[PDB]
Write a protein that binds this ligand. Structure first.
Ligand SMILES: [Ca+2]
Length: 158
């Protein structure tokens, strides 16, 4: 229960929820149809950044969270033109995302809103590099438990 209640006031998560809902629908689309609806996904990504800059949120965190969104969506429709390349000039983010996350988890209370965002994205199935590491699921699930308890408590992790 802590995740839904805790994340409802999270301005980072709110600014990206339209895009997340749009993507959850497109996953049940033919692959060619998903490529045609890339302009609206690009629009939603631009709005995510524009809305948070309107709200004076730190640009370093907007970029990091946008980098994660492109990595998450690129991982859903792949395995042409990737979103991470267009927005951050990087072909693959499955490794850097967890290095961004490790720096945030070094300062838990200072970056609570950013950490809730990371918790949710991983809850939506993001795995990045852990998809190709041996025992990668065990390592990833352990990382989610350490972060989820850091945000919500032992009872929320179970
Ligand atoms: Ca909260």
């Amino acid at each position: 229960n802590a995740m839904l209640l805790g994340a409802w006031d999270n301005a980072y998560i709110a600014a990206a929820m339209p895009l997340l809902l749009l993507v959850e629908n497109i996953r049940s689309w033919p692959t060619r149809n998903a490529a045609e609806v890339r302009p609206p996904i690009v629009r939603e990504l631009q709005y995510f950044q524009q809305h948070l800059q309107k709200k004076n949120y730190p640009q370093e965190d907007i970029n990091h969270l946008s980098y994660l969104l492109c990595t998450y969506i690129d991982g859903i429709f792949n395995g042409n033109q990737s979103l991470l390349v267009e927005f951050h000039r990087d072909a693959w983010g499955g490794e850097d995302c967890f290095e961004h996350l490790r720096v945030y988890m070094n300062s838990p209370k200072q970056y609570r809103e950013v950490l809730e965002f990371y918790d949710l994205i991983m809850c939506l199935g993001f795995d990045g590099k852990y998809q190709m590491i041996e025992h990668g699921a065990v390592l990833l699930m352990d990382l989610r438990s350490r972060l989820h308890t850091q945000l919500y408590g032992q009872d929320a992790t179970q």
